[PDB]
């Protein structure tokens, strides 16, 4: 309905959109796990990205019912996108990978949101 959404209702409706992102290979690969700046040799990552976000964290929040409203899920997805757009330059591979994920999410999310009311 509105405001009051059940955790299982949200998960069953929103999880396919997240799975659509996972299916993108290799585009989802940089976003499957939280960023490890020291592992990746980018020590200034947390200085630029104030609020890290990735697919595993979003999936965890859906499975544990940490989203009360479907729009909170969408916000985390765009936070993950913006982190990659902000930290990386437009010519970089991780930037282009992110833009492919955004395209997939933009084409899948509209019907799902309308079915949730
Ligand atoms: C989201 C997180 C934080 C961020 O915002 N930017 C990044 C930045 C960087 C790495 C990651 C990175 N990702 C992560 C790499 C691990 C494997 C990711 N895949 C898997 C599939 C093939 C693949 C191909 C190219 C690729 C990455 C990549 O990148 C090209 C490199 C990576 N270089 C150095 C020069 O360019 C980074 O400095």
Swiss-Prot record:
Residues 5-112 form the Bromo domain. Found in a complex containing NCOA2; NCOA3; IKKA; IKKB and IKBKG. Probably part of a complex with HIF1A and EP300. Interacts with GATA1; the interaction results in acetylation and enhancement of transcriptional activity of GATA1. Interacts with MAF and ZCCHC12. Interacts with DAXX; the interaction is dependent on CBP sumoylation and results in suppression of the transcriptional activity via recruitment of HDAC2 to DAXX. Interacts with phosphorylated CREB1. Interacts with CITED4 (C-terminal region). Interacts (via the TAZ-type 1 domain) with HIF1A. (Microbial infection) Interacts with HTLV-1 Tax, p30II and HBZ. The gene is CREBBP. Residues 44-90 are annotated as: Interaction with histone. It is found in: Cytoplasm; Nucleus. The chain holds residues 1081 to 1197 of 2442 of the full protein. Changing residue 82 to E/R: Abolishes interaction with ASF1A. It is linked to Chromosomal aberrations involving CREBBP may be a cause of acute myeloid leukemias. Translocation t(8;16)(p11;p13) with KAT6A; translocation t(11;16)(q23;p13.3) with KMT2A/MLL1; translocation t(10;16)(q22;p13) with KAT6B. KAT6A-CREBBP may induce leukemia by inhibiting RUNX1-mediated transcription. Acetylates histones, giving a specific tag for transcriptional activation. Mediates acetylation of histone H3 at 'Lys-18' and 'Lys-27' (H3K18ac and H3K27ac, respectively). Also acetylates non-histone proteins, like DDX21, FBL, IRF2, MAFG, NCOA3, POLR1E/PAF53 and FOXO1. Binds specifically to phosphorylated CREB and enhances its transcriptional activity toward cAMP-responsive genes. Acts as a coactivator of ALX1. Acts as a circadian transcriptional coactivator which enhances the activity of the circadian transcriptional activators: NPAS2-BMAL1 and CLOCK-BMAL1 heterodimers. Methylation of the KIX domain by CARM1 blocks association with CREB. This results in the blockade of CREB signaling, and in activation of apoptotic response. This is CREB-binding protein. The KIX domain mediates binding to HIV-1 Tat. Changing residue 90 to E: Impairs binding to acetylated histones. Changing residue 99 to I: Impairs interaction with ASF1A. Residues 82-100 are annotated as: Interaction with ASF1A. It comes from Homo sapiens.
């Amino acid at each position: 309905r509105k405001k009051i959404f059940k955790p299982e209702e949200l998960r069953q409706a929103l999880m396919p959109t997240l799975e659509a992102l996972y299916r993108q290979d290799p585009e989802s690969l940089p976003f499957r796990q939280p960023v490890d700046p020291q592992l990746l040799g980018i020590p200034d990552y947390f200085d630029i990205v104030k609020n890290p976000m990735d697919l595993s964290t979003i999936k965890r929040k859906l499975d544990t019912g940490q989203y009360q409203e479907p729009w909170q899920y969408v916000d985390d997805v765009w936070l993950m996108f913006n982190n990659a757009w902000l930290y990386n330059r437009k010519t970089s591979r991780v930037y282009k990978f992110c833009s492919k994920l955004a395209e997939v999410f933009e084409q899948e999310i509209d019907p799902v949101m309308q079915s949730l009311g």
